Design an enzyme around this catalytic site. Structure first.
Site, PDB file in Angstrom:
ATOM      1  N   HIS A 173      26.585 -45.635  45.027  1.00  0.00           N
ATOM      2  CA  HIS A 173      27.279 -46.927  45.409  1.00  0.00           C
ATOM      3  C   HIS A 173      28.495 -47.271  44.585  1.00  0.00           C
ATOM      4  O   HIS A 173      29.248 -48.168  44.761  1.00  0.00           O
ATOM      5  CB  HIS A 173      26.297 -48.232  45.344  1.00  0.00           C
ATOM      6  CG  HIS A 173      25.922 -48.336  44.095  1.00  0.00           C
ATOM      7  ND1 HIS A 173      24.798 -48.033  43.410  1.00  0.00           N
ATOM      8  CD2 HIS A 173      26.613 -49.393  43.119  1.00  0.00           C
ATOM      9  CE1 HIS A 173      24.739 -48.931  42.233  1.00  0.00           C
ATOM     10  NE2 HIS A 173      25.910 -49.431  41.933  1.00  0.00           N
TER      11      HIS A 173
ATOM     12  N   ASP B 122      20.700 -42.516  46.144  1.00  0.00           N
ATOM     13  CA  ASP B 122      21.868 -43.119  45.469  1.00  0.00           C
ATOM     14  C   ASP B 122      22.527 -42.456  44.323  1.00  0.00           C
ATOM     15  O   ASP B 122      22.113 -42.709  42.935  1.00  0.00           O
ATOM     16  CB  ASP B 122      21.397 -44.613  45.072  1.00  0.00           C
ATOM     17  CG  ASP B 122      22.817 -45.530  44.586  1.00  0.00           C
ATOM     18  OD1 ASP B 122      23.905 -44.870  44.475  1.00  0.00           O
ATOM     19  OD2 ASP B 122      22.496 -46.281  43.943  1.00  0.00           O
TER      20      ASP B 122
ATOM     21  N   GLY C 263      27.593 -53.479  35.988  1.00  0.00           N
ATOM     22  CA  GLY C 263      28.231 -52.726  35.217  1.00  0.00           C
ATOM     23  C   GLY C 263      27.621 -51.579  34.717  1.00  0.00           C
ATOM     24  O   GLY C 263      28.282 -50.728  34.324  1.00  0.00           O
TER      25      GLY C 263
ATOM     26  N   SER D  49      25.352 -49.827  36.590  1.00  0.00           N
ATOM     27  CA  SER D  49      25.163 -48.682  37.616  1.00  0.00           C
ATOM     28  C   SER D  49      25.700 -47.350  37.307  1.00  0.00           C
ATOM     29  O   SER D  49      26.847 -47.264  36.832  1.00  0.00           O
ATOM     30  CB  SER D  49      26.009 -49.365  38.673  1.00  0.00           C
ATOM     31  OG  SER D  49      25.575 -50.335  39.247  1.00  0.00           O
ATOM     32  N   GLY D  50      25.152 -46.393  37.641  1.00  0.00           N
ATOM     33  CA  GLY D  50      25.318 -44.747  37.366  1.00  0.00           C
ATOM     34  C   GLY D  50      24.994 -44.358  36.480  1.00  0.00           C
ATOM     35  O   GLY D  50      25.420 -42.917  35.960  1.00  0.00           O
TER      36      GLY D  50
END
Length: 224
Positions: free
Chosen positions: A41, A83, A174, A176-177
């Site tokens: 995402h 994801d 922020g 994320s990932g």
């Protein structure tokens, strides 16, 4: 990262920042000199990938441009299953004491395992404050069966949950990932959580990296 701590200088040399120009878009984790692993995402047409510093927007740290993304073909914009996404750097990064690929997992760590997740996400929610220094949160893997009590059908078979009971310590916007590491291997990528962030007994949710080992290998391969 809510209710976290400043990560220890250079204990996270696999951490990268994906920037939209200058500005924090997502976290990521270095998996090879040419490849970064992150959430699907997080996808954009291009990134500037900051490596080798715990400080976000560090003028001394190298940025390498990247334009090519390989999202897991199963990614859902509706449910956020699968994801996960690999990103190919324009140029390879030189390894050093500040830049090192993370260990990819050979197995799935069980519930109860102690982990740490890191990022430059906001340290407050809903009112946001973005840190300079990389922040860390110590969490523990929660079984699907427990995590389902909270999230029910939202949870797919390859989402992994982590948190601490009665504690706000968690991921946020922020982050994320970014990496969840447990036992010196990457077990998770930060995917999603409840909002506002940092609610006790609302686990953070992660892509369970041990379940994508064939795909990561197939996508990165450089020979056969």
């Amino acid at each position: 990262i809510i209710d976290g701590y400043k990560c220890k200088e250079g204990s996270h040399p696999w951490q990268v920042a994906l920037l939209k120009g200058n500005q924090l878009h997502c976290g990521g984790v270095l998996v090879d000199k040419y490849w970064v692993l992150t959430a699907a995402h997080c996808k954009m047409g291009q990134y500037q990938v900051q490596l080798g510093s715990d400080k976000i927007g560090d003028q001394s740290a190298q940025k390498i441009k990247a334009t090519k993304s390989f999202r897991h073909p199963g990614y859902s914009t509706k449910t956020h299953v699968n994801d996960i996404m690999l990103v190919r750097l324009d140029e390879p990064v030189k390894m050093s004491s500040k830049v090192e690929a993370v260990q990819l997992p050979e197995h799935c760590e069980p519930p109860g395992t102690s982990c740490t997740v890191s990022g430059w996400g906001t340290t407050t929610s809903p009112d946001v404050t973005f840190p300079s220094d990389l922040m860390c949160s110590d969490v523990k893997l929660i079984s699907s069966r427990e995590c389902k009590k909270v999230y029910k059908d939202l949870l797919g078979k390859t989402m992994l949950c982590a948190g601490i009971p009665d504690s706000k310590t968690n991921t946020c916007n922020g982050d994320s990932g970014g990496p969840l590491v447990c036992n010196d291997t990457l077990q998770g990528l930060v995917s999603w959580g409840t909002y506002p962030c940092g609610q006790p007994n609302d686990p953070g949710v992660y892509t369970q990296v041990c379940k994508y080992k064939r795909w990561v290998m197939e996508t990165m391969k450089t020979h056969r």
